[model samples]
Target: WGYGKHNGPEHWHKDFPIAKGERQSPVDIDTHTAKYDPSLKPLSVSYDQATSLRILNNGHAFNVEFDDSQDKAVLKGGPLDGTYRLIQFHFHWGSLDGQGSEHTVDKKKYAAELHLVHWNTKYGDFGKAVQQPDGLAVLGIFLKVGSAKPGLQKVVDVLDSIKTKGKSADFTNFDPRGLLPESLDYWTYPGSFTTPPLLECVTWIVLKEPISVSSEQVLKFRKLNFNGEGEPEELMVDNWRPAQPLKNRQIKASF
Candidate 1:
């Protein structure tokens, strides 16, 4: 269940066609200058609207989907309108100090990372949009294992309710929009899925700032089960796509 070194970053795209040319996410931004300023447009949603949130605890991970109707306005477009229904928030990390995140920065690895996947409404539904590049907007937030942060408590609190594989906890009155890195300033570029059949329609927005969690939390995540009903539990650690070649893509940053 361990795949590293012999199966490291350099060989991630060997099985794909044009993956070698796609603009990859998780580039180190500590050295780059971000231009998109999130401070100018802070993320704020009403409790009434946030109340419309619904999460599907479908075993694999906590997939949270906001109501796409007009009453709920977390997404830019109305619910079911056509703007991507941003759902499914989850983490990636390692069991030891070496691996955790999918994309690296200046070759510096972190403890873990989170992915928020969204799709364009122009397509039929999130199901169909996931297959198209223009249909997805995957937001990446890097998580460095360290001191305890109150922001993380919410996700952890629910763990008690969902401690095993194939268990989900439906939560309302939870606003994780704050879980995002404060520096909404990000680098946007065209890219493909880090997973199989990697297509090229993904617009990646990797956050520049990092959030903190505790080693204890990391340990709990380590105990997570990656297997299905029949398979053995895959001790999941460092389930991320190593950075691919940037090719010729330029990143658009919001500092």
Candidate 2:
């Protein structure tokens, strides 16, 4: 569960045998091998700003959770068969500004990565959905260093209050759409959770263009500590798992 030398992704297979599963995520996206499928439709998202509940630092990374009682905020079209409700979103980053994103583009690294997790409504809830192959869909947006994005700045501003593990703060009426790039062009593939347990039920929809966040904004997240009150001090950086093998699964693009 922790991303240290002793319990990091490298040693996850020791406890969670599925860490080496065939459909593990955060794979290296080779654009050259990415195929354009005309059959693939453009993805669209509808979000009710009121769905955002709060933001919390759950030891691993800070996550912005949502109210999923109804399908008010959902992802549709493209590679998805059923409407998937937005549950919670979190970020993964590196120890430094140069390398943080989990999914690499032709071996290229981004400053950070954003994950907007959604679950297929047909499964009733997240727990049951995670057990099926087509139960969940994740929107992965790569973050690059540039001018500040107002949407991201809002999240950064609250990081200070929830710097320690198990800390949380009220965060409502936040528009998740503001964090997305203008173009919805993306590559769709079957993948899994990058974290431990490494479930292989996710259908990943990764955006081609990255949203910008300033250097100061990116550094603010590092202020968050992986440790809680009594534990030793440790920066919450490099919480990303390395790219896993493709395992013959082809990536289809809706360019």
Candidate 3:
């Protein structure tokens, strides 16, 4: 029952104590309420195509690992106190196109969500960074089903090679910035990882503009299996955590 009835988001709290923490992520943004903050700097990204290492199905989501050994590719500026090195990028989606996105804008859901995870340099590494309040930053891009996205096609084409959990293929010389939307405008807030451990170390910078991908392209991710080879087939769909409560946090708009 991977991401199913028996053990889904609702049941995650039993194992991860921090799941119920106050700064949990993927909160539904009420645009009418988000305060525009002039102090927030524009989000910046520097990606070295060579940093892309491999793509793997990790039993949860198909993550594209990066060479975080250096600061070659990083996310900085917007609401960040320091440079955050790119660790990896992954996606979360649903069984149907209408119900995939993790964070919704004004109650509108998209086809999927992409997370570019980074760890603060001050903490040394992601291991120690995940334990601090301001140790991580995530740039979330909403994926809408519209025109075909050539950059996304590169990722979709490789899904077949890693259809089962633990399967992976070399995914080199690719620039992740090609997958981003044209606008850098975003909504910023204090939040946690949407997945387990649910550590409250993230500064969520969710882009207001969503990039395009064909419906066919977005559906290709569903072919991924949540179980390892030879195990029962469980499609890696609906792997997204539902939006958590906003609590005391206020999302700041960069526009």
Candidate 4:
């Protein structure tokens, strides 16, 4: 009952009331109307290369979880008051090119989007952080069609190993910072997790610059399985949730 017509974003409100809440995620960013805030500082990311633990196929999307027990990976200084610990990162994409990204710029969709999930260190853990107003900080990066992204290939190479649900592979010594575009310019706002529980606790930081990936690399993501080995095979494309309403929310820009 996940992402299917019966249990997708439309039906999520049945179990999670916050799905209908005003501050939902993946809103369309109209850069022309976004307000530039001079106070927004540069984003600070300190990630330990060895912090990455493993990659998992959770039936929804692929996730590369990190060791958050310590402060090895952290993000702060950008539209955030305190430090947010890096816990895990994941991606969302579509079956075809030019239609996958969750967030869009001027209503333009990209091939894919990457989310770096971080939790406020002030909170004991991610579970507890979700309950607070300023709990999570998700750094969103878009991917377009062009040159191959070598940094991301390190992750795509292991897709075959964890193609089905409940599958995982040993993936470590990888740094997420390398996947980011050269420019740090971004648009930010208060939002929620795109998936279930749909808690409104994320302070979204979406980059203006998109990294490039080859068409072949984009298709490889579709090779994943949403269902386990025994169940009917389901391609793991179009895992992204649709854009939510702006609801009079303001999108602040940091240029």
TM-score per prediction, in order, is 0.73, 0.98, 0.97, 0.97
lDDT of 2 at 239: 94
Per-residue C-alpha lDDT of model 4 across residues 1-255, encoded as one tens digit per residue: 487787787888889998899999989999898999999999887775438999999999999999999888889898999889988999999988879999999999999999999999998899999999899999999999899999889998999999999999999888887798999889999999999888999999999999999998888899999999899998998888989999999999997
Worst 10 residues of 2 by lDDT: 42-51
Candidate 3 wrong stretches, greater than 4 Å = none
Which candidate has the top score in TM-score? Answer: 2
For residues 75-176, what per-residue lDDT tens digits would candidate 3 score against the true structure? Answer: 889899899999899999989988899999988988899999999999899999999999999999999888999988889999999999889999988789
Q: For candidate 1, report its TM-score.
A: 0.73
Q: What is the C-alpha local distance difference test score of each model?
A: 0.60, 0.92, 0.90, 0.91
Deviation (Å) of 47 in candidate 2: 1.4
Candidate 3 local Cα displacement, residue 37, angstroms: 0.5
Worst 10 residues of 1 by lDDT: 73-82
lDDT of 2 by residue, 138-193 (tens): 99999999899998878988998998999999998888988989999999999998
